[PDB]
Design a protein around this motif. Structure first.
Motif, PDB file in Angstrom:
ATOM      1  N   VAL A 155     -37.838  -7.097  25.353  1.00 37.35           N
ATOM      2  CA  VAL A 155     -38.282  -7.402  23.971  1.00 37.35           C
ATOM      3  C   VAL A 155     -37.802  -8.822  23.814  1.00 37.35           C
ATOM      4  N   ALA A 156     -37.896  -8.819  22.641  1.00 36.46           N
ATOM      5  CA  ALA A 156     -37.493 -10.139  21.729  1.00 36.46           C
ATOM      6  C   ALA A 156     -36.806 -11.053  22.476  1.00 36.46           C
ATOM      7  N   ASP A 157     -35.192  -9.786  21.849  1.00 34.45           N
ATOM      8  CA  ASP A 157     -33.867 -10.698  22.812  1.00 34.45           C
ATOM      9  C   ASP A 157     -33.461 -10.440  25.300  1.00 34.45           C
ATOM     10  N   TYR A 158     -33.626  -9.689  24.299  1.00 37.46           N
ATOM     11  CA  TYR A 158     -32.684  -8.565  26.001  1.00 37.46           C
ATOM     12  C   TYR A 158     -34.536  -7.808  26.671  1.00 37.46           C
ATOM     13  N   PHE A 201     -35.310  -4.254  28.935  1.00 33.19           N
ATOM     14  CA  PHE A 201     -34.814  -3.055  28.939  1.00 33.19           C
ATOM     15  C   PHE A 201     -34.758  -2.833  31.015  1.00 33.19           C
TER      16      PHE A 201
END
Lengths: 49, 49
Positions: free
Chosen positions: A21-24, A26
């Motif tokens: 997802v956008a920054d980090y 999972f």
């Protein structure tokens, strides 16, 4: 910081699944089984009466 | 035989400004807790210094 024991895998190709997802990202270890946290109860005994 | 001014001096119980009520979950939002309440991709993004 929290520690690596989640990544440690014999065969990480099949076992790891990620989405960015956008920054980090999972990360899931497929073999690691989720477990509820005992000994973290809201009130230990709390006799209601 | 009572007292003349004693009856007049008596006054009713004072005003209660606020009435207590049940606040169901989900009403509280955007508090000052450090815990992650920021939602969407905004929470995941972290600025670069």
């Amino acid at each position: 910081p929290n520690g690596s024991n989640y990544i440690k895998t014999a065969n990480p190709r099949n076992d790891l699944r990620m989405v960015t997802v956008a920054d980090y990202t999972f990360i899931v270890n497929r073999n690691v089984v989720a477990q509820k946290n005992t000994k973290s109860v809201n009130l230990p005994n709390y006799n209601p009466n | 035989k009572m007292d003349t001014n004693q009856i007049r001096a008596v006054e009713p119980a004072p005003l209660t400004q606020e009435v207590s009520s049940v606040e169901f979950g989900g009403s509280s939002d955007e508090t000052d807790t450090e815990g992650t309440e920021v939602s969407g991709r905004k929470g995941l993004k972290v600025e670069r210094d």
